[PDB]
Every structure is written in C-alpha cells, then in structure tokens.
Amino acid sequence: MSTKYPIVLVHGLAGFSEIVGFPYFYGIADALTQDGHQVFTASLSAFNSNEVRGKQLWQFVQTILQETQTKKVNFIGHSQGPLACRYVAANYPDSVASVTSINGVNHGSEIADLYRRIIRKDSIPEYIVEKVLNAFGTIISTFSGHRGDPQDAIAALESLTTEQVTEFNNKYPQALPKTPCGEGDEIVNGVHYYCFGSYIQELIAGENGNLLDPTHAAMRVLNTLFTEKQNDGLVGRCSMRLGKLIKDDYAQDHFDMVNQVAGLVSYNENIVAIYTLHAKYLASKQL
Ligand SMILES: [Ca+2]
Ligand SMILES: [Cl-]
C-alpha cells in the first residue's frame, strides 16, 4: 500500500538539519521510503509570517510536481507546518490531496502568547517569567549549542500567537472546527484534512527515553503554564484541531511527536509507526 501522491513533510525551522546535524522529522522520511512512498521534506523559514511560509511551500511543491508529474501532494506538517500547508490547500486545492496536521498550532499557542507578554514587559509574576525563559534557553541550547538572546525567539513565536493565528484563520478557515474543540469537515474543495495531537499526562512507569531529553523537562514546565490543562507543552489539545480527528491522546510532548530529540520519547512509544500507519491509511483512501 504506497501512496498515489507524494508525501511532503513540512516544518517551520529551516536550517535545523544544518545547525543541529540530523532531520527534524527524526527517522520518519527513512521509514516512509522503506515502505515504498515517495517522500520530500520542505523546511520553511521560522522567522516569517505563516502566509510567507505558505508561499515558500507553494514554490517548493510547484517544483516537485513538475518532476513527479503527479498532480497532487499529501502534506504532513508539524507545529507551524500545518498553517503553511493550509495556505497552499486553500489557494491551490487542485494540487493538494491532503493536509495532515500533527500537533499543529491551528488556533494558537498559549506559550507564544505568554512570551509576547514577557517581551512587552507586562506584569507577569517573575516565577512564570523564569519558567518560560529557562525552558526556551534549555530548548534552544539543546538544539543549537547556545541559549540565544530572549529577543532571538520573538521573530519566530510571533506567528504562533492566538492573535496572529486567528488572523490567519479568518483568511483560511477551511477545515477548522466549528465548535470549540470539535472537528472540521474532512474534505474541503476536494482536499482531505486530518489531525493528530498529543498531551502530557502522568501515567505509570514512564517516561524512559525522555528522562535523558532536556526538551522534555522544558515541556513539562511549560505544560503547567496553560489555562488548557491538556497540552503538549507548547500547544493546547483543542488548538491542534483541523479536519477529521485521527488520534490526539498520545501521552507525548510537542517534540516527541516528531520523534525528538534524537528518538528520545515517552514510554518507548514507536512514533515513527504513527507516520507509516498514516501513510498506509492515505493510500487506502486512494491518495
Ligand atoms: Ca522527547
Ligand atoms: Cl530537516
């Protein structure tokens, strides 16, 4: 069961593989190709708007469609990636077979909102300020070797705020939940939409691998700062919703759902198998 249309993995941290030394979707393109699927990876700019990432993505896809002569692509995006995918699907539906959003910031990130308030010097209790700053420094240091300037992250997190995703969502409403925390239509203008998510949970005798992953400790701290108690450290469970829900109750953090860092995840969960099973599902729908 390989897909009719090529899979395009989409993320919003262009430069990751060059700076960090391994792919953002850790182990995923390899496993999908072992299974017979055509796989591309689109790495889009972190420091740009969602619209501008969507335009970069279209240029990427137009380019691969010329060569595969396949007409359409199946997008699999994580975090900011789905917003760029949504842009291409809304604009160029005849070129998009599906959009699959994995822990997408589809309605905004409470942590991005909080970081913005910090940079604006709103009155935030200092203990909250330190939790955010220290988690970001730990994440940024784990991947890049430097903790960064806290104004380093601004250009990136701005496009993930509830404000800026709301504005995006007004222009590109396709497949968005109607009800608070609902599902969207599976098919809009011929494009199939699917979503996956996860949230941090205290269950038994994990977390195993993740005990060695500094990003997981950062996510666990960030998790405590949200009004939405079910979240993945960066995005609240309901904010991830787009199109048809597949599964959103994995006990995983935001990074874990891309098998990071370096395959350190909770509970010896096989994250790559989430992606390979989903590819077979897409193929099963003649995509
Ligand atoms: Ca992890
Ligand atoms: Cl990458």
Numbering used by the authors: 1 to 287
Paper's wording?
The structure of Dieselzyme 4 was determined by x-ray crystallography to examine the effects of the mutations on the PML structure. Mutation of leucine to isoleucine at position 64 provides more interactions with side-chains F40 and F60, possibly improving packing to stabilize helix α2. Similarly, the R33T mutation that arose after the final round of error-prone PCR (see Dieselzyme 4) forms new H-bond interactions between the threonine hydroxyl and the backbone carbonyls from A29 and D30. Loop mutations G202E, K208N, and G266S and are located close to the Ca2+ binding site which is essential for lipase stability and activity. The introduced glutamate side chain at position 202 is positioned ~4 Å from R220 in an orientation that could form a new salt-bridge which may provide stability in the low dielectric methanol environment. In order to make this potential new salt-bridge, the helical region between residues 203 and 207 seen in wild-type PML partially unravels and may increase flexibility of the loop region to allow new interactions to occur. The evolved PML enzyme, Dieselzyme 4, catalyzes efficient synthesis of biodiesel even in the presence of a high concentration of water and has better methanol tolerance and heat stability than the top industrially used lipase from B. cepacia.
The lipase from Proteus mirabilis is a particularly promising catalyst for biodiesel synthesis as it produces high yields of methyl esters even in the presence of large amounts of water and expresses very well in Escherichia coli. However, since the Proteus mirabilis lipase is only moderately stable and methanol tolerant, these properties need to be improved before the enzyme can be used industrially. PML was shown to be tolerant to short-chain alcohols such as MeOH and EtOH and to catalyze the synthesis of fatty acid methyl esters (biodiesel) in the presence of high concentration of water.
